[PDB]
Symmetry: C3
Subunit: 149 residues, 3 copies
């Protein structure tokens, strides 16, 4: 309000990511998540300072994209319509992903009323993607098959 | 936006249900929850395709109602103002229930701007009810009394 | 809608608090949380009955403030920009805190359309504060250092 809603959602997302992090059992995913938590403070500042302070960089976005590609290689084909769940590790990541998608919606809504750097929405979008991959990888490493609709 | 918000909330709800499912210890509740997760994909399609694709059926609604009646028989009298919590199993179901109630609110809001089949809101309403019953049953089976306000 | 959104958020918050309560390992925090869950029913009635029924008292607000001061003494200096997480106990409290902050936003929005007692927003604000302190105390007692951005 106008960006207070976005800021609040970033905060909520960060808390959900912290929860997923505590449950994660792998260093690569844990490192991704901790990096993201720090990136979210930058995203918040970018949005709040109208881009006058620290800003979301293309490098930050590229890291998420690179990790997504790497994990897609580990998973292989991804059948559409994955039922979210399986393990608590994956479940927590799917909940975090849902909040990240809500963040995307809030950014889009706020952008129509206030100026927001394009990298903010782009980062949020890539974050939703990496969290989905984290969820799939977690189940795979725990020997839990995905259920499809 | 107009239904993007509803779709996003369905997604969030599905993730919370998946979490509650992983924590559940009984086949009847687990089966209800998995059925619901699949029903939510149908609900999403109904809303997105304006009812042109798959739609929420009265049969789907009736199943939830039948299960609610069955569980009400197991619980007996339900004193109003149950403090949500007790066990992690029940706590997760109460969180899922809160999101389902949010889904109801989002459907009502969207229905004033776009056409949405009546079965969509009805299903969402019954879902909020069954999740409440799941929470009560879970505590009962775990020997945890409910706390009342 | 106008206060239906506030009521729904209070419900969601109560469910998140119940989750954090189940995970808590200390009587002081557990007692605070249970008191809050009961206070939330009062907050809901205050909002719904337009202040005609039970209302949020200054005493209820004072209790939260007193507990916050007490816990600040246990923590000592609080470096700004705490990354939410560390333990599942703290993570759940940070998630609850995010929902409480959302409640604050919803109350502010609703107050511009309907009359709401000032104690309602004040209580919500203090609740967000105490949950943050609960999260810090939980990690401290579990020998988990906070991570700072």
């Amino acid at each position: 309000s106008p960006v207070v809603e976005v800021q609040g959602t970033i905060d909520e997302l960060n808390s959900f990511i912290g929860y997923a992090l505590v449950l994660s059992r792998w260093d690569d995913i844990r490192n991704d998540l901790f990096r993201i938590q720090n990136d979210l403070f930058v995203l918040g500042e970018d949005v709040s300072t109208g881009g006058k302070g620290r800003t979301v960089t293309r490098e930050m976005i590229d890291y998420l994209e690179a990790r997504v590609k790497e994990m897609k290689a580990e998973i292989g084909k991804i059948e559409l319509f994955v039922v979210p769940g399986g393990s608590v590790e994956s479940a927590s990541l799917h909940m975090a992903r849902a909040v990240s998608r809500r963040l995307e919606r809030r950014i889009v809504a706020a952008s129509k009323l206030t100026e927001i750097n394009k990298n903010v929405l782009i980062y949020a979008n890539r974050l939703s993607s990496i969290l989905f991959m984290h969820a799939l990888i977690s189940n795979k490493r725990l020997n839990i098959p995905e259920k499809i609709w």
